[PDB]
Design a binder for this molecule. Structure first.
Ligand SMILES: *[C@@H]1O[C@H](CO[C@@H]2O[C@@H](C)[C@@H](O)[C@@H](O)[C@@H]2O)[C@@H](O[C@@H]2O[C@H](CO)[C@@H](O[C@@H]3O[C@H](CO)[C@@H](O)[C@H](O)[C@@H]3O)[C@H](O)[C@H]2NC(C)=O)[C@H](O)[C@H]1NC(C)=O
Length: 136
């Protein structure tokens, strides 16, 4: 029977032979009637894993970008200041928080001048921390 075939092959029900998957195709399961066409990673994408007869190629994003979604279906540009990288992609810092860093970092809460026993000299932004004053 055609079900005794190993991975990296294709096999037909009417004439059972475990013929090797040809170049730039693959099969992970076994003795299917076809091989699947190998993925290519170009443009904004790069190869994280390459294709072989047994496994598919897997993609990365280029420098300055990052994978978005389940199986890196798209690339997103790395976050600006005032944004943070989350699972749903770059998102703006919520009120009271900030991030001054470009293409990196995490939204951290504003300095609390009352907690330090000080006055507020300048107000906070999504991209800028509060500036505190003297001690009261
Ligand atoms: C400076 O920080 C104080 C206290 O900060 C506390 O500790 C920090 C390390 C963080 O964990 C903070 O999340 C935490 O607040 C801030 O004062 C607090 O403000 C909150 C939000 O307005 C007050 O909550 C309210 O409390 C009343 C009852 O008192 C409720 O009815 C409201 O529904 C609401 O929950 C909270 O009372 C207050 N806490 C204290 C201990 O004072 C302050 O906002 C902050 N200042 C600045 C300028 O950012």
């Amino acid at each position: 029977s055609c079900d005794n075939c190993q991975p990296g092959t294709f096999c037909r029900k009417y004439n059972p032979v475990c013929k090797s998957c040809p170049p730039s195709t693959f099969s992970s399961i076994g003795g299917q009637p076809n091989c699947n066409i190998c993925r290519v990673c170009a443009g904004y994408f790069r190869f994280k894993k390459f294709c072989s007869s047994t496994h598919n190629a897997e993609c990365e994003c280029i420098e300055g970008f990052h994978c978005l979604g389940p199986q890196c279906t798209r690339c997103e540009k790395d976050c600006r200041p005032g944004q943070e990288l989350t699972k749903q992609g770059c998102k703006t810092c919520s009120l009271g928080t900030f991030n001054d860093q470009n293409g990196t970092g995490v939204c951290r809460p504003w300095t609390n001048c009352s907690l330090d026993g000080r006055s507020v000299l300048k107000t906070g932004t999504t991209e800028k921390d509060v500036v505190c004053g003297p001690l009261v």
